[PDB]
Structures are given as structure tokens and as C-alpha cells.
Design a protein around this ligand. Structure first.
Ligand code: CA
Ligand code: CA
Ligand code: CA
Ligand code: CA
Ligand code: CA
Ligand code: CA
Ligand code: CA
Length: 400
């Protein structure tokens, strides 16, 4: 009914602003002192029975050789991962499909390294990992190929030691960013290929929030025609029954993106896109945000758009909005993020969305609703019947 429908549209607009306010990409910066790069990013692992495990990544890369390399301007990589099982495989294994693209530098105002030439076709890949987490040792072998033209990787991994003592998803980032698609205007910022064929050292520390950490060191280089990733991993301070050693993480996160859900995203999109030209500008994003209480600067609005602007044109195209909302529904929000969403409606911070607060939000968004059909909205969400929406009830409206 067009009352549940109003929860979706308004709810979707609030999680869109949540997405636009978060940092989900792989942020690369030059590190002149090491002749390399450094990176930071946040990974989300869905917890099988509900919630999310965050993994905070810090990364450094260093050329193995003394050839000249490209030190980039600030940019990011966007990564889409799909995990699956080979139904003919009896060993503990993971099948990985990964697409990696560089963006985050807008179009305007101007080279292409020799390493880049090694990546114009399909390149075979080998991966070898030796790990030790809280004294539990394991090895992993992987094979596949990479197609940098489309930023595409296909890789199958076997645990050669028997049972993997951590969940496979926690190893994805560790187990070849030289396969990233860099667009034509950003070819001078591709450190990864510029270091080849002699290769780079890749190091990370990965902090699992409320749990232990991984430390990784990898050598990434050509052995003949093959791109080889050789890794050592050490994990300490894990909890025996946390999400990692207790294996409480989801293996396959669904890309179920229905025609019904796309249509719901288009309804939220059209709240931002008030002139109906199919794109959202800083002006339009600024207008919806001020209407909900917030007061961002031109610069903040430019950054928020930059975070999802795949084509660098300075606006959120409808397809870029569909891409960001698919990510937002594929991976679970932290409690801190759902509470932020709740506080948009819960104006006074008392733990309860009153019908006055919900209308304030609605009529502030230019949504004409009679006291009757505002009450229908509260009805829809209000399980415990107090005529208010508490946190646990909000968390129910905001689910698939
Ligand atoms: Ca580090
Ligand atoms: Ca527009
Ligand atoms: Ca764009
Ligand atoms: Ca465009
Ligand atoms: Ca939310
Ligand atoms: Ca309130
Ligand atoms: Ca209630």
C-alpha cells in the first residue's frame, strides 16, 4: 500500500545520504619517501545471523626494482567481488570474480608506463599464501587470470592444509591491483603496472573491529608470463568465539537486485533529481540535505558526489545512483550508521519517532500528507502499539 511505499522512498533517500557521507572505496595516495603509495579502506563482512563485521585496512606498496615508477595524485579504486563454490570441488575452496576500476579524479586539464604494456591481454595468475592466526597455520593456492582492459579477475583458491581456520571472505583483499582498469585520463596514476615486471611489495595491517588483526606481506611480480602473488599472513588477538575463529560470517553475499528494488531506488532518486534530468547536481543534493536539517559546504557536496561519480563528470547519473544503492543493500550497515539514519527522523534524540517528527521530515521533503495518512505510516512501523517508532521498529522498516 502507498504508506509502506512512503517508508521505502523516504528510507532509501536517508540511506542514499548515508552512502554519500561514508568512505567505501580504496583511497590511494603517493608516498614519496618510499618511492611508492599508501592506501586505506574499510571492508564490510556480513555476519550470517545479522549485523556486519568491519575490517579496517592500512596498506603500503614499494617497488622491488629501481626503474622509474608513477607516483599518483589522490584517487580511489572501486571493487565489486562475487564469491561462489565449484560444485565439483571437495577441498575447502573459494571461487572469486572481481572487477576493479580507478576513479575519483574529475575530467579536465592534462604518461602511460612500459609496465602497462604487459597487461593489454589476458594474463595468467598464481597466488601462494602461508598464514598463522592465533597459532592456527594454513596454506592457500590460487590460479586464474586477469584482464586489466575490463579490470576483471577470475581466481579459484584451495586450502592445501585441510580446513581453513578463518572465513574465506576475510582473505579476499590479501589473496593483484595491477589488474585495475585505469581510465584514459588517469593512466599516469597507475603505480601498480608501472612497477612491473620486477613488481612491488604490498603490506597491510587489517583491524577486525572488536577482534584481532592480520599483518600481511606480499611480493607481486612476473615469473615469466605469469603474475604471481606470494603472501605471508600473521593474525593475533583473535577471540575463540568471535566472528572470525567462530566462523560466523556469510560466505556468499547475494547480488539479488530485483526489478521491484530498482523501481524503489528510482523513486528515491527522483526526490534528489527535482528537475527530472536523470542526474543529481551539488545544488540538488545540497537542497535535500538542508531540508533534513544538515548544512554542508559546496566542498563537502563535491566530495560526497566524487565518492560515487564513476565517469568524473561532477554529478550522480541515475546508473551511478543504482550502483551505490546496490552496494548499500548488498552489505549491512553498522549500528552507528543505522542510528545516524534514525536521528534524521528522531529530531529531539529521545529514542522515539513521534508522528510530529515524521511529518516534519515528510512536509520538510515537500511531501503533502494529511494527519490521517501520516498516522497510517506510524501504524505500518509501530509493532508495540505506542503510536511511536522506536529504534528496533525503525531497523525493521529499513530491511529487505
Ligand atoms: Ca600498515
Ligand atoms: Ca537533476
Ligand atoms: Ca557522474
Ligand atoms: Ca554522465
Ligand atoms: Ca540505514
Ligand atoms: Ca523523538
Ligand atoms: Ca512503537
Amino acid at each position: 500500500d502507498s504508506s509502506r511505499r512512503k517508508w521505502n522512498k523516504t528510507g532509501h533517500a536517508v540511506r542514499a545520504i548515508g552512502r554519500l557521507s561514508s568512505l567505501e572505496n580504496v583511497y590511494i595516495k603517493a608516498d614519496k619517501q618510499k618511492n611508492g603509495i599508501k592506501a586505506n579502506f574499510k571492508i564490510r563482512h556480513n555476519i550470517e545471523d545479522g549485523g556486519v563485521q568491519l575490517a579496517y585496512h592500512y596498506q603500503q606498496n614499494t617497488p622491488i626494482g629501481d626503474g622509474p615508477v608513477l607516483l599518483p595524485d589522490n584517487h580511489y579504486l572501486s571493487v565489486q567481488s562475487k564469491l561462489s563454490k565449484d560444485p565439483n570441488e571437495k577441498r575447502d575452496h573459494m571461487v572469486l570474480l572481481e572487477f576493479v576500476t580507478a576513479a575519483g579524479i574529475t575530467l579536465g586539464m592534462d604518461m602511460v608506463s612500459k609496465g602497462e604494456e604487459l597487461f593489454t591481454g589476458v594474463v595468467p595468475i598464481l597466488v601462494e599464501l602461508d598464514g598463522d592466526v592465533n597459532g592456527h597455520k594454513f596454506s592457500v593456492s590460487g590460479e586464474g587470470e586477469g584482464d586489466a582492459t575490463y579490470g576483471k579477475l577470475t581466481l579459484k583458491f584451495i586450502c592445501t592444509t585441510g580446513k581453513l581456520p578463518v572465513p574465506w571472505p576475510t582473505l579476499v583483499t590479501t589473496l593483484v591491483l595491477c589488474f585495475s582498469r585505469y581510465p584514459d585520463h588517469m593512466k599516469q596514476h597507475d603505480f601498480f603496472k608501472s612497477a612491473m615486471p620486477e613488481g612491488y611489495i604490498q603490506e597491510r595491517t587489517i583491524f577486525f573491529k572488536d577482534d584481532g588483526n592480520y599483518k600481511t606481506r606480499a611480493e607481486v611480480k612476473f615469473e615469466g608470463d605469469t603474475l604471481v602473488n606470494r603472501i605471508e599472513l600473521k593474525g593475533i588477538d583473535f577471540k575463540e568465539d568471535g566472528n572470525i575463529l567462530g566462523h560466523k560470517l556469510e560466505y556468499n553475499t547475494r547480488d539479488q537486485l530485483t526489478e521491484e528494488q530498482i523501481a524503489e531506488f528510482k523513486e528515491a532518486f527522483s526526490l534528489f533529481d527535482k528537475d527530472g534530468d536523470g542526474t543529481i547536481t551539488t545544488k540538488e543534493l545540497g537542497t535535500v540535505m538542508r531540508s533534513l536539517g544538515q548544512n554542508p559546504t559546496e566542498a563537502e557536496l563535491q566530495d560526497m558526489i566524487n565518492e560515487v561519480d564513476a565517469d568524473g563528470d561532477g554529478t550522480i547519473d541515475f546508473p551511478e545512483f543504482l550502483t551505490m544503492m546496490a552496494r548499500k543493500m548488498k552489505y549491512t550497515d553498522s549500528e552507528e550508521e543505522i542510528r545516524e539514519a534514525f536521528r534524521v527522523f528522531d529530531k529531539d534524540g529521545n529514542g522515539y519517532i513521534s508522528a510530529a517528527e515524521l511529518r516534519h521530515v515528510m512536509t520538510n521533503l515537500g511531501e503533502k500528507l494529511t494527519d490521517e495518512e501520516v498516522d497510517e505510516m506510524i501504524r505500518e512501523a509501530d509493532i508495540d502499539g505506542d503510536g511511536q517508532v522506536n529504534y528496533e521498529e525503525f531497523v525493521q522498516m529499513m530491511t529487505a
